[PDB]
Structure formats: structure tokens, C-alpha cells
Amino acid sequence: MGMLFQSGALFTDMSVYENVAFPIRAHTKLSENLIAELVALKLESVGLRGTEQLMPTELSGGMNRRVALARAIALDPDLIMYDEPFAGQDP
Amino acid sequence: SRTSELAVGIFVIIFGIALFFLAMKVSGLVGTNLSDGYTMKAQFDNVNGLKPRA
Amino acid sequence: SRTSELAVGIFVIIFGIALFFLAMKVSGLVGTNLSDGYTMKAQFDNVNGLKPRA
Amino acid sequence: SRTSELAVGIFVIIFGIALFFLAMKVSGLVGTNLSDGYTMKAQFDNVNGLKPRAKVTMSGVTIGRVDSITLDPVTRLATVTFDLDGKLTSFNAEQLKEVQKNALDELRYSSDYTQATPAQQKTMEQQLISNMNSITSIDEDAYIMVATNGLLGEKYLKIVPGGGLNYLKRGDTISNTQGTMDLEDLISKFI
Amino acid sequence: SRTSELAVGIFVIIFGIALFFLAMKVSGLVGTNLSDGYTMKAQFDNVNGLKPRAKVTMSGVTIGRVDSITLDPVTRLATVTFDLDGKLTSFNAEQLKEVQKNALDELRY
Amino acid sequence: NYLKRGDTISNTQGTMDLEDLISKFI
Amino acid sequence: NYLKRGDTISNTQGTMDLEDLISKFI
Amino acid sequence: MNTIAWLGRLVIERIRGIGVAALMLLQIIFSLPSAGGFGRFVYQMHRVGVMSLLIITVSGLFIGLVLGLQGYSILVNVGSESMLGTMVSLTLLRELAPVVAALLFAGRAGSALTAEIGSMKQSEQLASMEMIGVDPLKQIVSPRLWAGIVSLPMLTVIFAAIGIVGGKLVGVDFLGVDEGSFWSGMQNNVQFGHDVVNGIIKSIVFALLCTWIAVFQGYACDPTPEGIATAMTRTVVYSSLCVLGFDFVLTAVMFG
Amino acid sequence: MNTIAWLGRLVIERIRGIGVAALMLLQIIFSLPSAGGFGRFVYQMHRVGVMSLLIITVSGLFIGLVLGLQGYSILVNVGSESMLGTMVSLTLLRELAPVVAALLFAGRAGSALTAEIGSMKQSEQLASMEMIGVDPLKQIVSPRLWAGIVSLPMLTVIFAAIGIVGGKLVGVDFLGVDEGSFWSGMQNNVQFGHDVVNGIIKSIVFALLCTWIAVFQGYACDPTPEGIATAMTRTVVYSSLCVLGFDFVLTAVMFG
């Protein structure tokens, strides 16, 4: 189970590559050519793949929850809770 | 529960202003006199650098 | 309201004390300022280490 | 759950007030921290400025404190109340055994035993009831005086031992003293 | 990464400078060291205001420190224990014959 | 003669101050 | 007769503190 | 050479950053008084002055007691502690009441002022007030400035008085000197128009730099409440570099 | 008698409010070390330590110069200014380096620590981290505590060193004494194990109370960003009452 924090909960000191890889390293030890591999897939499954270099800063608020969505599907849970996905953003 | 709440305010301002009286007791602006302390006086010729209340 | 004029009064009254405590309990203002004073002047040959207000 | 915070939260403040009395007395403002204390008294003619809580030395080592100054108006002699600690005065059991052999040697000598009557076996017997307690390293004629600590500084009671052949009790009055000396009293004789 | 880690390194340097400046330019740690400092004892009567950890002199010059002082309450006299240098305070391999030549000549003269 | 590592000096002289000095004159 | 670098002054006077002066006087 | 350019463009911004803040200050004091401003002002002095009174009173003691402890420990071997009433007074009158009461005032009311205005910009009360045309410089800022200029010299006096009384407490009641030589050794040496009035002129020009730098960083901060908290610690640095720096430039003038 | 109950109920809360904070402290230090915590810690010491270095260096001077100004103005009429190297040193070693460097540290890194944790509770990074089970006491708090215990005694030493050098500057280069005499008296009075090491034991137990009270008010604050800014000025009051109050005792002790 992994959840979504209403406003999106990103750590504004670690990179966006370090956000999504963080629940893997907090959970399990794998080699770097696999830990850097799963992030490049889950970042494509949200559609934001050309990142892993820039920070959580200079991410538009629309793109902000999508990374937080990818951390919500880090490993591959089966119970994700959404606290208001439609915050009042653009249609 | 007024057993707890106001009793703190009872104890503190009792203890607070009683501490404030300790300030004026040592201040040199309130009292600290003597008792049955008579007074004499003498006549000298030289008092070189004697300040009062010595 | 009246809750503001009170506790800003008590700040002034404490400040009323600690200005009087400096004025006439520490610095000489109560000792100085004699009454009807003239001028007597003399001339020396050596007055080193002599200051005004002596 | 909050009442355990009123359990711990009182305890730290209780730990904070109770520590502060330990940090007060060791530095020393109230509550003298010398162990096994016992009060002695003395009388002076002149204590020309001597604050309470001053120090007492034996030949330099601090061995007590001064409690307060009492004056008696019908006799106009000063009286100083002071407390000592026996860990470095008031002999222990082995040093108890160097004075009974000395009272058998010096007091009970060939000429000194028969100074009153040549049957003074009670002289060591009477002294032993005053030797397990009520015994000072200070002699029966060791006089106390007021010192100056260098050339400019606070006065302190300095005890001069030496001579004599008997000893006091825990709480006696020092029968021989000496008062201070003032700067005007210096220039009086010198001029 | 390396951007802030090395700029921590100049902070340890600046603290490292101003500890040396406190240890070995002000504090008496440059003047505390002896060499096989042996210990003596002496019996005084007046040690008024004589603290421990002083600096002893012999002939116009320092040699060492004073270790610790108590009273001996059996003869009412001060006891002073103090560190005494076994080097500059004594002699050395040259001087052993230099005192052997003089303890012999001043005895058998 | 001289001293071993650990001995006593047979001649001491205690400190003197103002409380002793003026009586030390006369 | 002037001196060079590293020479030796053969005339020196030591210190005499206050306690030598008092015993000198009285 | 690029981090050189980052440092270079940073302190170029800090200079301009000052030149705005001086223009905001001249726009406040050169204005007609608002109607009924006194009732706003007295409530403001309740907030800045009277609230800070407790933390400077009990901090007035602990500066006094350590001055009454080291001031005794120094003066005993020299013996001439007729200066205890003078070496408690002349430090506390000349330096530690202007200096230390500033660094405690920049702490509480120096930094709680830049939050209260920092909160008012973010929720746009200050923006909403402008559309009604009440121009919030005269409404919110100006009573929050004049309750800082007046209320700091009313505090250092209370700091210096409780400091001297504190030095007398552990001096003569727990260690013991002449209670006569304290004040009679004091009152004679300490002039009024040379020392106390110069001890307040320093505490006015500290109150100006400690509040005008404080009320500026609340007004010209940004929103996004990591923008408040970066500014409430931008005053407390910028105050204490300018309290102590302006102190030393002043004490060389009056006590050269 | 109702405002009596409000005052009574307030300080009852402040006591419990402490008893929580002690339990948070024992839960930090009695724990196994996290994997790779050193790389977190050194980056943290780069945030708390190295950033604050500038504001204490240039504040190290202005305390030194005023000590080198009043220390000269006092000592000239008594003439015995062989104590200038000793009355700059013994105050700066015994009190003003433990005291004044604390009130400047509670200012910058004492209050920027309670904001950074105050921001992390509100955006619920700390809540999100718990659901992944990384227990943020060991992740965010504990490197932000050990970079405060270590980094303050590394600052008072830098404060006291630049203070003494500052007193020598306006002393002998602008007023003029015998530099020799200076250094002489300086090193001929100041022991190392009695004064400097006692000047650091005071600066450790100040670093504990100034950081543990600071890191607590960020953790146990509330959201609603008037809840950050009420807490960043709740430390700076609560630090400075406990810096100076804990100084007195300590001083008196290590200075009977």
C-alpha cells in the first residue's frame, strides 16, 4: 500500500530521480543497473521520462502530482489511496 | 476542573508579586529602616573624603 | 479596548520607576545643583590629573 | 496519554530545581559543603572587617568556614562563631595511638608524671574519654590570629599550633587569641 | 556532493587554526611537559595562598611544577608533592663524569 | 651531597605576608 | 671594543625582588 | 568563473535591496497623521512592548548576577572593591544595556514583526486593502513602526535598572560588602547627562535600525510560506550585524 | 476569577509540553545508527555550521573592539594596563563566548532549524515518509540534531579566537601598548585545562538546550502557516531564557 498526499509530498532536497527511487532503496537492496532501470520505466508510465535530472523545483504543479503518482506506484503495491486527485487544476 | 486551572493562577501570582517585593526590599527605594536606633553627633576638625551613610 | 490601555499602562509605570531609580539613586543629580553660587578663582603651577566636576 | 506528560513534565522540573541546590552549595553560597562539621567559638578584641563565610587555615590548608559575628555590649569584645571539618584535623585511630604514647612519654615522663602526685595512672585514663570524640589536633595553647592574605586582600583566621601537651574538645572556646592591626596603627609606631 | 563537503573542509580548518591558537599560543600546554619527572616531598609551615600547579624556580629560571599539597594531621605541618625534572633538573651523559671528576677530587683532596 | 628521586629537604622557610611582615621588622 | 654577531657580554646583573630589599633594610 | 558571477550578482542585488528600503522609510514618516491612529498605535504598543516585558526582566537578572559574580571574583585579590558599585554600573550603562537588550529585542519583537506582516502579504489582505484605497503603509506598517521606536528605549532603561539591582543582590546579600560603599561609590561617579542620556541616544538609533530592517523584510518578502520563514531569519542576521557594528562606531564618538 | 483559570491552564500545558519533548529526545539518541547516515550528517553540518560561519566571524570583531575600547578607557587612569591582555581574555573566555555566541546561534541556525522541520510537517512529507516506514525521527530529525551539538563548540572557539585578536588590533595598533607585555600577561595567567576546557563544557550544554528546544518546536508545531511563524518565535524566547539561566549556575560552579 502506497498513498497520495493531497498536495503531493515531494522532498525538495532530493532529485526527482531520487524521489521515485527512494522507496526501493528504503525497502530493498538491488544493483544500480536495476534500481536506475525501474525508475526510467515508472517515470515513463506517467509520461514524464525525460527528467531524472532536474529537481522537484521548476516542476509545474500539474506535473507535481504525477511524480507523486509514480512514487505511489514505486515497487508495485496493490492498495493506493487518493486524497483528491482533482485538486482544482486545469480541465 | 477548577481544582487545577485557577489554582495555578492562584499560586503563581501569589509567588510572582511576593518575588517582586523582594526586589523593592533590596532596591533601596523601599524602607529597610532600623529600630529604636538613637542618634548622637560629634564635632570634628578634619573629615577628609568621608561620604555620608558610610 | 480597555484590555490594551491597561497592560500598556503597567509597562509605563515600571518605566516610571526605572527612570527615577537611575536619576536620583545612582547618578548625581540629587547631590549637585547647589544654591546661589559665585566665582572664586585661583592660579596654579601644576594641575595635571585634575578634572572638571571635582 | 496526556497524564504521563504531567508525570514526566513535572519530574524534569523537579530534577531541575533539585539539581540547582546541588550546583549552589558546591560552589557555595548557602549550605557549607564540608563534611562532619562541628562548631567552635572564639573571642576577639578587634575584627577590623571580616565578612561571614571567610576561610580558616591551619598552615595554609583551608579547614573550615566562619558562621557569623556576635558582639556583647556589656563587655565590648567581639565573638566569632566558626565551623571546622575533621578529616584533616581531629586525629583518627592510628593518630589516636601517637598521642597516648606521647602522653605516656611527655606528660608521664620521669619528672613530668610526678608533678602533682607519683600515681598519675588516671591521667591517661581521664584523657581517653575525651579522645574517641571531643578531640582536636589544636593544642591547649595554640592561639588563633587574623591574617592578611598577601599584602592586599580579605582577612582570614589563621591558627598557629605548636607547643603544649593537652588538647581541646569539639566545641570549646579558644582561650588565646590575637586581634588585627590597622594601617593607622602601622604609621603610629613607625612615625 | 563534493560542492558542500569540501566547503565543510575549510570550516574544520578554521576551527583547527583557532584551537591551536588557543592551545599553543595562550594556554599553558607548551609549558606543562616534563621528562621522567620524579617527585619529592617537603614539610613546611606556611603555604598561604600557594595554589597547586604552580611553576617552580631554582636559580632565576623555571624547572617545573607543583603537583599536590595536603596536611599531615599528626605533626601539623604542610606536605608538598611536586614534579621535579630528571633532565635539565639533573644532568645527562656528559655531566656524569663531570660530577664523577668533582665528587672524587673534592673528597680525596 | 645531593638528593635522590624522592626525599625531603631538611631546611624550609614558610611564606610571609603583611600579617607577619610588620612584626618581622620588630 | 665593539661586538659582533653572537658575542658574549661578560658583565651581567641579576634580579633582586622586594623580599631582598626588606631584609636589607630591616 | 561562474560561481564568481553568482556571488557578484548576489551582492549587487543586496545593494539595490537597500535602496528600496530607504524609500519605504521616507514614505512613512513624511505623511499626514491618519484619523484615529492613536487608538491603533496604543494597541500596537500592547503587542510589541508589553508582551516583550517579561523576557527582558528575567533576562535582566542573569546578566546582573554574572556581573555580580565575576565582578566580585576579579576585585577580591586587588582588594579595592570600592569599584564594585562602579564596575557593575559603568558597563551596564554604557554597553550591555544598548547591546544585549537589542539582540533580545531582535529575537522576540524584532522577528515577530516580520512574520505578522509576512502573513498579511500572503493572504492578500494588504492587496485587498489597496483596492479599497486605504494604502496599507499608513494602515498596517506605520503603527507597527512607531510602536518599535518608542518601545525599545522604554526597555533598556528597565534592563539597566534591574541589572544594577541584580548586581547588588548577590554582591552584598550573599557575598558581603559595605551597603554604604555601593551607592556612595556609585552616585558620585555616574553623571546623568553624560552617561544615562548617552545610554539612551544609543538605544534610539538601535531601535531604528532594528525595526526598519525588521518591518521591511516582512513587507518586501514573497508569498509561498517558505518565503516567510526565509525572511524571519533574514532580519535576525541583518539586525545583529548592524547592532554591533553601529555600536562600536558610536562608542568611539561619545567615549573617545 | 476566569482569567486566573486561563493563566492556570496555560502553564499546566507548558509542563506537559516539556514532558513530551524529553521523550522525543531519548527516542533519538538511544537508537541504532542508520545506514549511510554519515553522508546525511555531513550535508547537514554544511547547512547549520558552515552557513552560520560568516555571521559569527564579523560579529566576533565588534565584540572584540568594544572590549578593546572600554578595556582601554577604564585601565588608563589606574595606569596598570598589564591587565589589558588579561581583561580581554578572561571575560571572553569565561562568559561572552558561551553566552553571546549562543544568542547569535539561536538567531540564525536556532530558528532556521525549526522552520525547515516546520515546513516538512505541513506539506506532509513527514506523514508520507511514515507510510513508507522510514520513521522520520531517524531520517530528518537526527542528522539535524547532531549537526547542532557538534557545530556549536566549533563556533565559540572561532568566536573567542577572533575576539582576542580583535582586542589586540585596536589596542596596540591604534592606541598603543607594549605588545610584548600583552602576550606575556596573556599566556602568564590563562590556564588551559581550567579555563578553555571549562569554556567548552559550557558551550556543549548550551548546544544541547539550544537545539533540542529548537528541533522540538518544529516537530510538534501545527500546520496552517500562522502555525509555523508562531513557533519560530517560540524557540528564540525559550532559548534565551535557558541560555542565560543555565549559564549562571554553571559559572558559579566552575567558579566558586
Numbering used by the authors:
A (entry chain E): 92 to 182
B (entry chain L), C (entry chain G): 3 to 56
D (entry chain K): 3 to 193
E (entry chain J): 3 to 111
F (entry chain J), G (entry chain I): 168 to 193
H (entry chain A), I (entry chain D): 1 to 256
Study authors write:
The MlaFEDB complex is an ATP-binding cassette transporter to actively translocate the phospholipids between the inner membrane and the periplasmic protein MlaC4,5. The MlaFEDB-mediated glycerophospholipid (PL) transport was reported to play an important role in maintaining the integrity of the lipid membrane. Consistent with the previous reported low-resolution A. baumannii MlaFEDB map8 and our E. coli MlaFEDB map9 (EMD-30355), the MlaF (cytoplasmic nucleotide-binding domain, NBD), MlaE (transmembrane domain), MlaD (periplasmic phospholipid-binding domain), and MlaB (cytoplasmic auxiliary domain) subunits are assembled in a stoichiometry of 2:2:6:2. In summary, we characterize four structures of the A. baumannii MlaFEDB complex in nucleotide-free and vanadate-trapped conformations using single-particle cryo-EM.
To understand the mechanism of glycerophospholipid translocation coupled with the conformational change, distinct conformations of MlaFEDB were trapped using sodium ortho-vanadate. Vanadate acts as a potent inhibitor of ATPase by forming an ADP–vanadate complex that mimics the intermediate state formed during hydrolysis. All three structures display bound nucleotides at the ATP-binding sites. However, the maps are of insufficient quality to distinguish between ADP, ATP, and ADP–vanadate. Comparison of Vtrans1 and Vtrans2 to nucleotide-free structure shows the conformational rearrangement of the MlaD. MlaD hexametric ring rotates clockwise at different levels, whereas MlaFEB remains unchanged. The three vanadate-trapped structures of MlaFEDB reveal different levels of conformational rearrangement of MlaD and MlaE coupled with nucleotide binding and glycerophospholipid translocation.
